[PDB]
Each structure stands twice: as C-alpha cells, then as structure tokens.
Amino acid sequence: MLDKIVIANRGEIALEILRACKELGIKTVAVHSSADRDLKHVLLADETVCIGPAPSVKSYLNIPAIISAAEITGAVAIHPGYGFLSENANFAEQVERSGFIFIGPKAETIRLMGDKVSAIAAMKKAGVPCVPGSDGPLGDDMDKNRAIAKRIGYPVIIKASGGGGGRGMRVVRGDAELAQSISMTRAEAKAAFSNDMVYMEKYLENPRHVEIQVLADGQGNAIYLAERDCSMQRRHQKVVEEAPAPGITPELRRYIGERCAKACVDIGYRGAGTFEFLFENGEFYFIEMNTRIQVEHPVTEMITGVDLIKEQLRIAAGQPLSIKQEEVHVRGHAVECRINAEDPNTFLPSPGKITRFHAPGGFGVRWESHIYAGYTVPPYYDSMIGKLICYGENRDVAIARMKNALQELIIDGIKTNVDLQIRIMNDENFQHGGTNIHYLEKKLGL
Amino acid sequence: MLDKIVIANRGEIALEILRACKELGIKTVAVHSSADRDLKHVLLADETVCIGPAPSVKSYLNIPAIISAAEITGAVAIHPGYGFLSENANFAEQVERSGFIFIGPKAETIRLMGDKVSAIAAMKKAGVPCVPGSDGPLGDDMDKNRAIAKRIGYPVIIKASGGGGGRGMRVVRGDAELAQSISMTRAEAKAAFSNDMVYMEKYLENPRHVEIQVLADGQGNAIYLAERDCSMQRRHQKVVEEAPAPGITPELRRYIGERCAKACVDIGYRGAGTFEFLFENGEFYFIEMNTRIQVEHPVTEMITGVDLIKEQLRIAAGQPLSIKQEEVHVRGHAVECRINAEDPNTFLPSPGKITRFHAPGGFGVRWESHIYAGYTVPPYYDSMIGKLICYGENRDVAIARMKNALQELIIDGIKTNVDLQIRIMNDENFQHGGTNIHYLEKKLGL
Ligand SMILES: Nc1ncnc2c1ncn2[C@@H]1O[C@H](COP(=O)(O)OP(=O)(O)O)[C@@H](O)[C@H]1O
Ligand SMILES: Nc1ncnc2c1ncn2[C@@H]1O[C@H](COP(=O)(O)OP(=O)(O)O)[C@@H](O)[C@H]1O
Ligand SMILES: [Cl-]
Ligand SMILES: [Cl-]
Ligand SMILES: [Cl-]
Ligand SMILES: [Cl-]
Ligand SMILES: [Cs+]
Ligand SMILES: [Cs+]
Ligand SMILES: [Mg+2]
Ligand SMILES: [Mg+2]
Ligand code: NA
Ligand code: NA
Ligand code: NA
Ligand code: NA
C-alpha cells in the first residue's frame, strides 16, 4: 500500500479517489486552484496545497507545481484522475523521474495510445479489429486521399490524431467536400491540440458505442470487466452510459474482451484503461483507448462488484491483480446520467450561483457531486456538475429508478441538462434499447 | 392503488413517503407549517397546503386543518408518518369519519396499544411474554406497592402508561425511594402527557433492545420482517439501530416473530407496526408496540428487500399482503446513525444556520435529510436533522462503511452528534456487538 498520495484533480473524481484512499488507509493530499479552496475534496483531504490561480493552465495543468505539492508533503504517488494531465505523457515521465509513482500507465504507453494513428497501428498488430481507414496520416495528395475514400466507402470522417473531447472531427459525404474538410480539420486541430496530423476513417452510420473496461497489473495479468454502452451522445460527447450493453451476449463480450486483454499484455499496459469500439452489424471496430479511469466507471462497479479506483491503487502499489477473469460476473443493470451546466449556445461551462440544491436518494440511487446550495459554478473547468447513477435488477428497473431520481433532483439558479435527461429516460426508443450513436442528435434536431 | 394522499408530516419521513408515492404513481399533497414552506418535500409534492403557523400545536398537530387539506385537494388517504399524530386515535377516527383512509391501524388498535398498561394486558392474553410487573395501574396503597416490588424484585422502574419519547420513567432501587418516585413520575406524566396513570415494571439490568417489525393487512395475514437491535441509547432514546440483531439465531427470530404475527391477528392489527422487546438471558420481554412506521425502517428494508412504506400504501389500498413469511430472507447487515442537532444541556432541538453541508456517498451508503447548506434549523420540532444508513455483506463491513461515511459527512454552523457517532463506531465493545441498553450512558458518564 501507498502511504500517501496526491490527488491531482478536482470535483467528482477527486471525491471518488479520496473515498478509495480512506478505505485503504492512504493519506491524501488535495491540490487546488485558488478558486477551488473550499471544494468538498479539499476540506476532506488530510493535507492541501494551492497549486496556482483559477485558470487550468496555471493550476491543474501546472506540472512543476503538482510535483512540488508531492515533494513538500512527502507523497509517494500521484493520481491524475481523468481529464487534465491524465493522458499527458510528459506529466507521467516527470512524476516518475522526480521519484513518484504515477497512478496510470507507463509514459510510453500513454504516447503509444495517445497518438490515435499509432494506437490504431498497434491495435491492428495486436489482433484487435479497427475501423477501415487510411492507416496512417493524411498527406496533401488529393488523388490518394480520394482513393482511400473509395477503398473504404463514403461517408468518411476526418479525425485529429491528437484529438480529444469530441473536437477535431469532420464528416465528408463525397469527393467534392474532401479537400476542404481535411483542410479545416487540420486547422481546427492546430488551434485545439497543437497537432494537425489527421487520418481518415470510415464513418459508421449504424454503430453503438460499446467500450471495454480493462485492468492490467503490468506484470503480465490483464482482465476485462464487461462493457459499457455510451451511445447517447451530442457533439461526440457522452450524455448517458450503461452497463452491461443491452443485448450484448456472453459470446460477444468474451470475443472482444479476450482481444482487449491480449492487447494489454502486448503493449505492457498497466492500470485501468478502456478500449472504445463502434459496434455495427455484429462487428466491433476499435476507435481509441482511454489510458486512464473514465467518468462512467461507477456503472461497471455496480454490475461487477469491482471498485476500479481501489484496483488502480493496489496496482500502483505493485500488487498483482486481485481478481481472475472467471471471477468477473455481471449482475443487474446500471445507468448513469451526467449532470452538466453547459451554455447551450457556445458549448462552454455555464457559470452561475446555485440557489437551491437537493440530491436524490432511495435504494439503488448513487449521487456524486461537489456542488451544494449557494455554490458558484466557475467557468474555468468542465461543464459536468454531478453524476447520477442508478442500479436495478434489470434494465427496465434501472431506467425507471433513474427517471424518478432525476425528478427528485433539484438544481436551481443555473441552466442544467436535467430536463433533457428525464426526456431521454422517457424516450420509447431508448427504453427498447440499442439506439445508435446518431440517435440523440436527430431527436434534438441538431 | 390510492389516487392521491396527504403526507401529514415533514422532514425525512415526508421525503420517504413522497418517494414511495412516486414509484407507485400516487399523487401527493404536502402539508406544511408556515416555517416549512420551502422544505424539500413541499417543493417536490404535486400539491401543497399550509396548515398553520410554526408551532406544532398550530400546524402538524392541527387535526381540522390536516383534514381540510385532504378535502380541498380531494385526497383519498392520509399518511401520518411517525411522531406527531401517528399514534393519536382521535386523529385516526376523525380521518376515517371524514371519509378518508388512515394509513395506519384502526383507531381502536391505536387506543388498545397506545395505553401501555392495556397493551401489556392484551399481549399477555395473546401469548406474548411481558416484563414482570404490577399488571395494572399503581394506586396509593404503599403496602401493595412495596409488595409488587418484592414480588418482581428490585430494581424496578415506574412508567407512564401514556408515556412516549423516553419521558415519564423513573428507576427505584429500594423501598425507601418508592413512594416519592411514584409521586414525581405521576407529576412528570401529568405535565407531559396529560395522564398520570403509571405502572410498575421490573428494571432489567442486562437487556438488549430488540424489536420485531411486522406487516399485517387486517384481512388475517401477518408477517414479521426479522428484527432490529436498538440498544445504543441515551435518556431512553435510540442513537444507533441495526439489523439483524447481532447473534440472534433463526430459532430465536422465529420464536418471537411467530408470537408477534399471532398477536397481530388476535388484535386485528392493520399496517406496519413494531413490537419492542427487552432481551435478557435468552428471554424476550415485551415493553411496548409502536403502531406506526419507525424512524429506523430502512435498516430492515436493506436486509430484507422489503420497502415498508410501499407496503403501508398497498395495505391501505385494500390489497392483501404481497409477501409470505417463508419469502422473508435476511441478507447482509445494516446500521443506522441518527444525526441530531440537540442542545446537550437542555435536550431540546438546537436552532442555527448550517453554513456548510456535504452528504456522504459511495456504495452501500444511504443518506436521508431535508437539510442543505444555508438551512436554518427551527427550534419547533424534533432534533433529528438526518439519517445515515450503511449496508454491508456482514456487520464488520457495515460498521467500517458507517465510520467512513460519518467522516465524509460535513455539517458546520450547528452542534451535531456526528463526533459521538464516530466514537460509537470506533468503540471496541460495540464492534464486538451485543452491548446492552445501559452501555452508552455509562460510556458517556451520564
Ligand atoms: N468512424 C466513426 N464513425 C462514426 N462515428 C464516430 C467515428 N469515430 C468517432 N465517432 C463518434 O465520435 C465519438 C468519439 O470518438 P473518439 O475517436 O473516441 O474521439 P474522442 O477522442 O474525441 O473521444 C464516438 O463515440 C462516435 O460517436
Ligand atoms: N423494564 C425496563 N427495564 C430496563 N429498561 C427499560 C425498561 N423499560 C424501558 N426501558 C428503557 O427505556 C426505553 C424506552 O422504553 P419504552 O417503554 O419503549 O418507552 P417509550 O414509550 O418512551 O419509547 C427502552 O428501550 C429501554 O432502554
Ligand atoms: Cl485515471
Ligand atoms: Cl430501439
Ligand atoms: Cl406510519
Ligand atoms: Cl460486547
Ligand atoms: Cs486516446
Ligand atoms: Cs405505545
Ligand atoms: Mg473517445
Ligand atoms: Mg419505545
Ligand atoms: Na464548471
Ligand atoms: Na424537481
Ligand atoms: Na429541528
Ligand atoms: Na468531515
């Protein structure tokens, strides 16, 4: 066990990490921007270090300051959570070169899987099925560019190799739009990711977003913890996540799961990670790996009994995996609704003061949030303000519970997506299950 | 199913009733004092009626106003929750005489079991074991009074027949103290309950407080849902409740459980109710029946899978019991900690403004409360401000979870018993389990 860790994050994930540390008897160090001084996770941590002013670049992305916090507190490890620096290889290597355990994969693995182009190359080599595409970056030869398109079949999607969070993606319907679409994706990617490498991928018109949770100890053992369906999306971002994926058979789970576990071993993967697939006409197609814990980790926890953050900590401590593959069982069903305060016109976090707040309760209802009545939501970070996760003995029970939980939830003073979430739960097509990644945008007329 | 009900209560129980109504598709009517206008349960109810000013006598105990609220909204039933008028037979008969279903026992049953003297008489007649005692009210014949004492054995306790909430009770160690102890209990009882009938009971020096949950449909069917141990007490009031009772065997459960189920039938009991026993040297001794839902109902729900409030509503609707005795199973363990804001000098609710509030989360952790950051706690009602209930696969897991949950809980600005609760969870004697009703007072030096 690690004696003391720095939690290099904020919000729900910092709260979840702190909870896991407490159960394992790990001393905690909270870093915060000056704006997050009074957040729940800061109050509850054993020690706190202010790591800079409000802007993320100055604080939560401030690598030297985070390392300093670790050194002055004498921590032995740093948990990056998700977002921020969690998939920053430079951060990972600095942490480890400064004599700290990085609670995540090796830096080289973050680089390998962090470049989406190279991630696909490694996956193909490993025997993991991928989306037909350019299999390498796109040049300026518009003849080979249109030929790749013909070989894979329109529509196609232009994707930023350094891309993330849904940004740096453009669909192309025909030859006529290809050249300019490639051009403004590169421009979009330069501006957002400081990397204008793009590739081409077949645009799948009827897939579900089905992702595989893995854990690997980096000592040769790797397991899959069933799957999640995250097909309810807007602007390529997830709104609702569930586990298990509706209608996925033990056969399909095992098929793709064992290929992911083998890929982990081939790449020397360490820690928690997720292989994201598009699933269409009975076939899985790898799109990317998230080399980190994910927002929606609790739905997997609910259906498997496996606390993924606890397992991150045991792995980081050097323990081999405490769970064998055949010990992983799927029981019941879980649904997560992300609660966001996003400006609907700009897609940016919506600042404001919460004037009235009440969290839902009851059996099978889990709420995770740093917000409280009188909280001022800052514009500096992301738009998620809470996570609502309901368990049921089956999917119908889980959805019904979620709907009731959402109607118990009170958040006044700021704009939220609570009303949208209730409408999704009441959606007949969602209730039947297996709706594809394109459904919500069409429903909403986007 | 009932179309619409009035929730004649406030706080946690009103929230729990509203939740149950929602799941069953029952329209809800919240009554409130003028002081409770913005409480969570008022906000969430379909309709709201202000039933009077802040003082309970003027509002929550205001029988005509509560009935009026039912008539103007066209409700078909009234749920009294616990406390207040829930064991007021006058209220029960007025509700039913005005053409509404009272969600509870028949008025005559409330009277029968509401007079503790007559409750004991009926229990003995029914074959339920009771504490040796005077078996009738105490007169002024101090010779027969000391003779009863000799027959049962000192120490003895003088108990108000109309008593409740821990008040109107006095221990007597010898003949020398008997006459005056009887005198000031009667006086205490006149002042508090407007009834100075007292009886004598053997004062049990090593019992656990073990109570049996029942449900009865009033159509001849009655089941017991295991037991709760509520031995952690101060001034005769419960601080911690758990289920099942540690070390109670299937044999002991069945023994006392079947006697309670038979008593229900003999008295024509209807709805949820609890038989409270003292358990000493392997023997159960009835002390009283609570003819209503209890605060600690969720620990039973957690270990049995039975939602007791849902079952109250189905029974009130005229449905026979939806559960057979052999279908009742005990799985895992649950512990509840009452969170109180009580003045430690006067034993009265402590008013104040909550300056910072954060509820605990995580697996197996349930929080029930109407409080929020910026809430002003009124002095008008009771001192409980929330209920924290943790589940575990066994008792050690449940206690460990509770301890962690209590340390995650933040309530600033007002005095609470959170620190006491943490200390109880850390108490080696509690951790071994089976501590008696006298333990906490001795621990605290009271
Ligand atoms: N080839 C594709 N066809 C159709 N939709 C896609 C494709 N690639 C990505 N998407 C959509 O964009 C989402 C995010 O894609 P991903 O590659 O994981 O980007 P990011 O790195 O921004 O998360 C997917 O869940 C899917 O809905
Ligand atoms: N005969 C007794 N011997 C010892 N303790 C008792 C006895 N009767 C009551 N008590 C204590 O007082 C508590 C409440 O008693 P009860 O009769 O249920 O009164 P109330 O109606 O106020 O709840 C019991 O849980 C027990 O701890
Ligand atoms: Cl992570
Ligand atoms: Cl569908
Ligand atoms: Cl009740
Ligand atoms: Cl003990
Ligand atoms: Cs990636
Ligand atoms: Cs009683
Ligand atoms: Mg992705
Ligand atoms: Mg009692
Ligand atoms: Na924000
Ligand atoms: Na609401
Ligand atoms: Na109060
Ligand atoms: Na605390």
Curated annotation (Swiss-Prot), chains A, B:
Substrates-to-products reaction catalysed: N(6)-biotinyl-L-lysyl-[protein] + hydrogencarbonate + ATP = N(6)-carboxybiotinyl-L-lysyl-[protein] + ADP + phosphate + H(+)
EC number(s) recorded for this UniProt protein: 6.3.4.14
Binding-site residues, hydrogencarbonate: 238, 292, 295, 338
Binding-site list for biotin: 338
GO biological process assignments: fatty acid biosynthetic process; malonyl-CoA biosynthetic process; negative regulation of fatty acid biosynthetic process
Listed pathway(s): Lipid metabolism; malonyl-CoA biosynthesis; malonyl-CoA from acetyl-CoA: step 1/1
Binding site for Mn(2+) 1: 276, 288
Named cofactor requirement(s): Mg(2+); Mn(2+)
Alphabetized Gene3D superfamilies for the sequence: ATP-grasp fold, A domain, ATP-grasp fold, B domain
Pfam families: Biotin_carb_C, Biotin_carb_N, CPSase_L_D2
Binding of ATP, residues: 116, 159, 165-166, 201-204, 209, 236, 276, 288
Residues that bind Mn(2+) 2: 288, 290
Ribosomal protein recorded as keyword: no
Cofactor: how and how many bound: Binds 2 magnesium or manganese ions per subunit.
Mutation effect (residue 296 to A): Severe reduction in catalytic activity
Top-rank lineage group of the source organism: Bacteria
Keyword field: ATP-binding, Biotin, Fatty acid biosynthesis, Fatty acid metabolism, Ligase, Lipid biosynthesis, Lipid metabolism, Magnesium, Manganese, Metal-binding, Nucleotide-binding
Reported effect, residue 19 to E: Loss of homodimerization. No effect on ATP binding
Residue positions binding Mg(2+) 1: 276, 288
Subunit structure: Acetyl-CoA carboxylase is a heterohexamer of biotin carboxyl carrier protein, biotin carboxylase and the two subunits of carboxyl transferase in a 2:2 complex.
Protein known as: Biotin carboxylase
Native source organism of the sequence: Escherichia coli (strain K12)
